[PDB]
Amino acid sequence: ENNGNSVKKNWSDQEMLLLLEGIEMYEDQWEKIADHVGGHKRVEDCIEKFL
Amino acid sequence: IMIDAASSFVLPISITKNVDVLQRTDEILWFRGPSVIVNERIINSGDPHLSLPLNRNEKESLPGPFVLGLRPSAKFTAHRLSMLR
Amino acid sequence: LQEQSELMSTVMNNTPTTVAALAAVAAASETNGTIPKPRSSAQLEQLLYRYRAIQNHPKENKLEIKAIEDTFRNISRDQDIYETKLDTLRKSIDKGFQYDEDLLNKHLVALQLLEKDTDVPDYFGDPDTEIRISARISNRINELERLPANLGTYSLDDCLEFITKDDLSSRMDTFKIKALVELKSLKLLTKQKSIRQKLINNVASQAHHNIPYLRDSPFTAAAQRSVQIRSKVIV
Amino acid sequence: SNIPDPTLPPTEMMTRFLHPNWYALPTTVWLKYGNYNSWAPSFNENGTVVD
Numbered sequence A: 001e002n003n004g005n006s007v008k009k010n011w012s013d014q015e016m017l018l019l020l021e022g023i024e025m026y027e028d029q030w031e032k033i034a035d036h037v038g039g040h041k042r043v044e045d046c047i048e049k050f051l
Numbered sequence B: 001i002m003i004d005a006a007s008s009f010v011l012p013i014s015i016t017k018n019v020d021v022l023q024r025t026d027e028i029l030w031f032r033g034p035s036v037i038v039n040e041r042i043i044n045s046g047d048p049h050l051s052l053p054l055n056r057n058e059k060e061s062l063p064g065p066f067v068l069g070l071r072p073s074a075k076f077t078a079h080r081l082s083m084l085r
Numbered sequence C: 001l002q003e004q005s006e007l008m009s010t011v012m013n014n015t016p017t018t019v020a021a022l023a024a025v026a027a028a029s030e031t032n033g034t035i036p037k038p039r040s041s042a043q044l045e046q047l048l049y050r051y052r053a054i055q056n057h058p059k060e061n062k063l064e065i066k067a068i069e070d071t072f073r074n075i076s077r078d079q080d081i082y083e084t085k086l087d088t089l090r091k092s093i094d095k096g097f098q099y100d101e102d103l104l105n106k107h108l109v110a111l112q113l114l115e116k117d118t119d120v121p122d123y124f125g126d127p128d129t130e131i132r133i134s135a136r137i138s139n140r141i142n143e144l145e146r147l148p149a150n151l152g153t154y155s156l157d158d159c160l161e162f163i164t165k166d167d168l169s170s171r172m173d174t175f176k177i178k179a180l181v182e183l184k185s186l187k188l189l190t191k192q193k194s195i196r197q198k199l200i201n202n203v204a205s206q207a208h209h210n211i212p213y214l215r216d217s218p219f220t221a222a223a224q225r226s227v228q229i230r231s232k233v234i235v
Numbered sequence D: 001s002n003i004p005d006p007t008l009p010p011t012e013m014m015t016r017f018l019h020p021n022w023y024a025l026p027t028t029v030w031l032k033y034g035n036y037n038s039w040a041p042s043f044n045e046n047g048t049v050v051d
Helices: A013-026 A030-037 A043-050 B074-084 C003-012 C046-054 C065-089 C101-115 C128-134 C137-144 C178-185 C189-203 C218-226
Strands: none
Touching (some): A013 A030, A013 A043, A030 A043, A043 C189, C003 C046, C046 C065, C128 C137, C137 C178
């Protein structure tokens, strides 16, 4: 999808899949992970969700 | 084997008079190959028309392609529209 | 040498009369170590059906027909025994028990979890046991990597959308995303381990400047004070 | 990517940890002069924590 999802800390399966795609892509560079999730999530929350 | 070929083309003449039914850019898009028509997306994986069991020259004119496509029955759809409101 | 897979290979290669496994003592008995009483529901039984139905033409070159027919007799006898026992079992039922609901719940959930190999809660170092964990993850990876890529759902909520001959419903991929979140989360394990090491070895590596009840003790403050003593200047 | 398989032998995650509750603290240093030196200053406490 392309639409803005619901209120944060829901983490639909699309966002989990794109996060894991980003981690397989870049191996670092959490700005380039957080935009690939969709850019409506911060670095400091993508790291708090991958841990 | 490349990936980044263009594979779509546009002619310069604006022929946009009788073309509201095709796929427009927003001109007319002209691809490098044809389309692909797919009858039904979901395969019906059992159904001994397709599964071919090993037990027991015959023809059968089945009604439509809709046998092979998992359609729901209408009583459930009426039940769900009753559950709508 | 898997004769119950050799029959399947001869069936799926569509040439079973041309070889017929060379039924003598040297070949048909070397793979058997009678026939070993097939295990499946019908996947190893329809093969025996077709094998007897193909071996009705030679009828004397294959001496192993008799043991297969003895196992057919065994299957028919066991089936008749089970039908008599099911006739008696439906007559041996008490007229009133009133089976409890909230234990039927637990038996259904417990059976369902014990079918598909997951851990059931009760409610009724050491690299020996490190490999026994790292050999269950390779199980799940080489079980998820044999799913077909053209996997798709059909929920009971597509009836409210009226999908035509070609309409592309919007809940078709609620299982293939879930079957990749697991398969890629079980490959990014030794990346989150390396991030957790860099987290813990930089939070616990201070441990006496952030935690308040440790940097206020006598001995920690005395040690941090005593490491900072500048050496004495002679004259 | 360049990640490894999770069936590789480093799966330890705690090998050389050494929390600073487990550090060695500086304490007194008892000295030995000789066999017949019983009036000398016997030990040494420059920067010790305890007595």
